[PDB]
């Protein structure tokens, strides 16, 4: 792609790590919004949510400095960023499908249909605000890819042991982002503007029940056991 021409070495690797993959339902499973899942099975929002959790972990391992960190620092970064990463990935792929929510291949729902599947007016409001920022920022493919790595390398992550290393790793990503926006658009200010406009659901605890869909994600799949398995 023409975009990688304005990236540095780290920037090319982060674009090639593909944080833009989209979750899918199992092969041959048709989705019909009118035909309820209710009673032994889980709905498509959760199926896609769990598929995406696995994809986020798979992406994180391709991020240069991640595997060098000790297992508990990798576990801390993922736990802290899962909500922000899911929100960023979802909002970005929704942009051509607006006003609908594009949860995954074969699943595009209006905001009203999301409510019947697990979401509440509170989670709808958060997604609305997150899409609005990406639209304002006018984020391109490269910028989205780099933003995923910036969200991952969060130095204030709870239970993080090697804070200076994550700070330096975030620094390396910041350098790739300013390098890119300067080389392609020749606007020194663009990197700082997108970084200041980006919502961060960690400033105020995401446990505020406005976007506590992570409790359903952590409860059903027992995320701690799966993360250890995937990072081993
Ligand atoms: Cl995909
Ligand atoms: Cl430097």
Numbering used by the authors: 158 to 389
Task: Please quote the paper that reports this structure.
To this end, the NR7 LBD was expressed in E. coli, purified to homogeneity and crystallized in P3212 space group. One molecule of the NR7 LBD is found in the asymmetric unit of the crystal, suggesting that the NR7 LBD behaves as a monomer. The overall structure of the NR7 LBD contains 10 α-helices arranged in a three-layered antiparallel helical sandwich with the canonical fold of NR LBDs. In particular, helix 10 is shortened to a two-turn helical portion (called H10’). It collapses to an unstructured loop at the level of a proline residue that is conserved in NR7, but also found in HNF4 and RXR that is further connected to an almost perpendicularly positioned three-turn helical region that is a remnant of helix 11 (called H11’).
By analyzing these unclassified NR sequences from emerging model organisms, we could define a new subfamily that we named NR7.
